[PDB]
Amino acid sequence: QYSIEKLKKEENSLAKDYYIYRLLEKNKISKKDAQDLNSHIFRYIGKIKSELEKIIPLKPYINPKYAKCYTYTANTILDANLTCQSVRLNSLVFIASLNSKDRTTLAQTFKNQRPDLTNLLLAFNTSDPMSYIVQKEDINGFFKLYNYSKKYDLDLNTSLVNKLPNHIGFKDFAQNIIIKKENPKFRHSMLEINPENVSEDSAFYLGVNALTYDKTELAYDFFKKAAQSFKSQSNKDNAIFWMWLIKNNEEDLKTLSQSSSLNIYSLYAKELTNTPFPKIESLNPSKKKNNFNMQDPFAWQKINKQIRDANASQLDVLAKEFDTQETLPIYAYILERKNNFKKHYFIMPYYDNIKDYNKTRQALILAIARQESRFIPTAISVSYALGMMQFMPFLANHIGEKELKIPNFDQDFMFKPEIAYYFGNYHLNYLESRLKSPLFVAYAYNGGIGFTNRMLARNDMFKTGKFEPFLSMELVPYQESRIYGKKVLANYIVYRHLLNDSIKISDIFENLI
Numbered sequence: 172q173y174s175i176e177k178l179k180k181e182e183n184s185l186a187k188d189y190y191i192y193r194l195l196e197k198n199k200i201s202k203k204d205a206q207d208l209n210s211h212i213f214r215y216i217g218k219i220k221s222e223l224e225k226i227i228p229l230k231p232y233i234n235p236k237y238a239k240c241y242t243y244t245a246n247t248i249l250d251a252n253l254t255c256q257s258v259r260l261n262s263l264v265f266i267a268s269l270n271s272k273d274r275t276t277l278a279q280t281f282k283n284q285r286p287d288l289t290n291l292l293l294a295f296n297t298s299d300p301m302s303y304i305v306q307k308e309d310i311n312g313f314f315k316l317y318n319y320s321k322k323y324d325l326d327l328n329t330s331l332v333n334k335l336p337n338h339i340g341f342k343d344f345a346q347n348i349i350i351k352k353e354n355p356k357f358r359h360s361m362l363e364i365n366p367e368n369v370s371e372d373s374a375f376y377l378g379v380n381a382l383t384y385d386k387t388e389l390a391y392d393f394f395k396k397a398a399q400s401f402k403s404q405s406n407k408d409n410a411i412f413w414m415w416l417i418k419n420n421e422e423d424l425k426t427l428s429q430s431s432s433l434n435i436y437s438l439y440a441k442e443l444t445n446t447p448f449p450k451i452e453s454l455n456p457s458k459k460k461n462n463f464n465m466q467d468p469f470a471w472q473k474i475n476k477q478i479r480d481a482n483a484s485q486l487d488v489l490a491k492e493f494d495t496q497e498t499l500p501i502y503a504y505i506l507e508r509k510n511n512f513k514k515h516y517f518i519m520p521y522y523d524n525i526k527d528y529n530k531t532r533q534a535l536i537l538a539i540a541r542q543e544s545r546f547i548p549t550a551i552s553v554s555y556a557l558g559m560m561q562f563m564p565f566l567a568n569h570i571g572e573k574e575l576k577i578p579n580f581d582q583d584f585m586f587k588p589e590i591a592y593y594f595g596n597y598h599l600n601y602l603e604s605r606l607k608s609p610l611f612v613a614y615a616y617n618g619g620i621g622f623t624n625r626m627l628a629r630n631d632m633f634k635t636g637k638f639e640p641f642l643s644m645e646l647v648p649y650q651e652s653r654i655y656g657k658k659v660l661a662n663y664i665v666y667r668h669l670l671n672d673s674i675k676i677s678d679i680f681e682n683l684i
C-alpha cells in the first residue's frame with residue numbers, strides 16, 4: 172500500500188481515488204492530511220466524499236451575491252427585497268412552508284414579471300397544487316412539482332401531454348414512471364402523445380407504455396419513430412425488433428438480421444432467417460510481451476486516457492505498441508475504438524485459468540468479464556469494483572478471507588486474473604444454482620440476488636404472455652441491470668459459439684418464461 176504522500180504525486184484518477192478511499196476507510200487520513208485533499212480527488216462523489224466530510228465538513232456554496240437572501244425565513248420573507256423574494260421562491264419546499272396569506276401577497280407581487288412564481292404560489296394555496304398547475308398548462312411548473320413530489324398523479328389531456336416532451340425533464344419522467352409502474356394516470360395519459368413529438372429513448376419508452384395497455388398500433392408507431400431517430404445501431408435494432416414482433420413485416424426482420432451491431436435482437440433475427448452467425452475477429456499477436464505492467468492500476472488509468480484522446484492516427488501507433496500476447500486486452504481495446512466499433516472482438520485472455528471448467532461455464536465467465544472490464548486486469552469502476560470480474564470489495568473480502576481463507580488475502584488480489592476468474596466461478600456457481608438462466612444470473616451478478624428474486628416473484632414479470640419474455644426484459648426496474656443483462660446475454664451466445672458449444676438464443680428465450 173501507498174502513503175498519502177506518495178499518492179499525492181500520482182495523477183488524479185479513479186485508481187488514485189480508490190487508494191485514497193482505502194486510507195480513509197482504515198482511518199489513516201488525519202485532519203491535517205485532509206486539508207488539501209479534494210484537489211487530489213478525480214471524482215468527488217459518493218463514499219469518498221462522505222468519508223472525507225466526516226473529517227472536514229464542507230460549508231459552501233452560497234453565491235455571495237445572494238448570501239443575505241438566506242438570512243430570511245418563511246416568517247420574515249415579506250421584509251426581503253424583491254430579488255431576495257424571488258431567489259427563495261425557487262424552492263417549492265420554501266413555498267409549501269409559507270402561510271397562505273403570504274402566498275397570496277407574493278403571487279400579486281410577481282404576477283407581471285414572474286407568472287411562473289404566481290402559478291406555484293396560488294397552486295400551494297389549494298389542496299392539490301398539481302391540478303392547479305395542470306389547469307394552467309404550466310409546463311415548467313409541472314416538472315418542478317413532479318421533482319418536489321412523485322406522489323401527485325392526475326389525468327392529462329391531449330394538448331398538455333403533447334407539450335411535455337419539449338422539456339429536458341421529460342425523458343427521465345417517462346422512463347421512471349413507466350419502469351417503476353408508478354403514476355398510473357400520467358402513464359395512461361401518455362398514450363396520447365403524438366409520435367411526431369418524441370424521439371430516441373423517450374419514443375421507445377412510450378412504445379413500451381403502449382404495449383402495457385395493449386395499444387399495439389400506437390406501440391408500433393412509437394417504436395418506428397425510435398428506430399428512425401436512435402443514434403446507436405444497437406438501440407435502433409431493439410426498436411426494429413419491437414416493430415417486427417408487433418406487425419411481423421418481414422422487411423423489418425430482414426433489416427434487423429443484416430445489422431452491423433451484434434446484440435440479442437440481431438442474433439435472434441439471424442437465427443429466425445437462417446442467416447450465418449456474424450464474423451468474429453481473431454487476434455493472435457506473435458510478439459510475447461512488451462514493457463507495460465498489466466498489474467499496475469496507475470499505468471492503466473494513464474494509457475486509457477491516452478487511448479480515449481487519441482486521434483485516428485495515434486490509435487495506429489498504440490495498436491502496434493500493445494500488439495503482444497501479454498497486452499492482448501489493451502490491444503483489443505485499442506482495435507475496438509480504432510475500427511469505430513464495426514468489428515466484433517471476443518478475446519479469451521488468461522484462458523489457462525478457465526479451460527478445465529465446462530464450456531457453458533467458460534462462456535458465462537467470459538461474457539461477464541467482457542462487459543465488466545473488457546478483460547483489463549486492473550479495471551476500477553466509479554464504485555471501486557475491482558479487476559476483470561469487477562468484484563465489490565465487500566464480496567471480494569467475504570470470499571477471499573472468510574470462505575476461501577486465502578493466506579494474506581487483500582482485496583487487490585482481484586486484479587490478478589487467476590483470482591478474478593476463480594472468484595467469478597465461485598460466485599456464478601452460487602447464483603446459477605438458484606436462478607438457472609444466464610440472463611437471470613447476469614441480472615443478479617450486477618444488481619444482486621435480492622433484487623432479482625423480488626423481480627421474479629412478481630406476477631407481471633417473466634410469466635407467460637403474448638410479448639414475453641421480451642416485454643419483461645424492457646421493464647427490469649434498474650436501468651444498469653436492464654442494459655447489462657441484454658449485453659451479457661449476447662456475449663454468452665457468442666462465446667458459446669466460439670467454444671464449439673452453440674446454443675440457439677430461441678432456447679434461452681423459451682427458458683425465461
Ligand SMILES: CC(=O)N[C@H]1[C@H](OC[C@@H]2COCCO2)O[C@H](CO)[C@@H](O)[C@@H]1O
Nearest residue numbers: 542543544545550551552553556561655
Ligand atoms: C471498469 C468499469 O467501470 N466497469 C463497469 C462497466 O463499464 C462498461 C465498460 C465496458 O468496457 C470497458 C470499461 O467498462 O459497466 C458494468 C455495468 O454494465 C459495471 O458493472 C462495471 O463495474
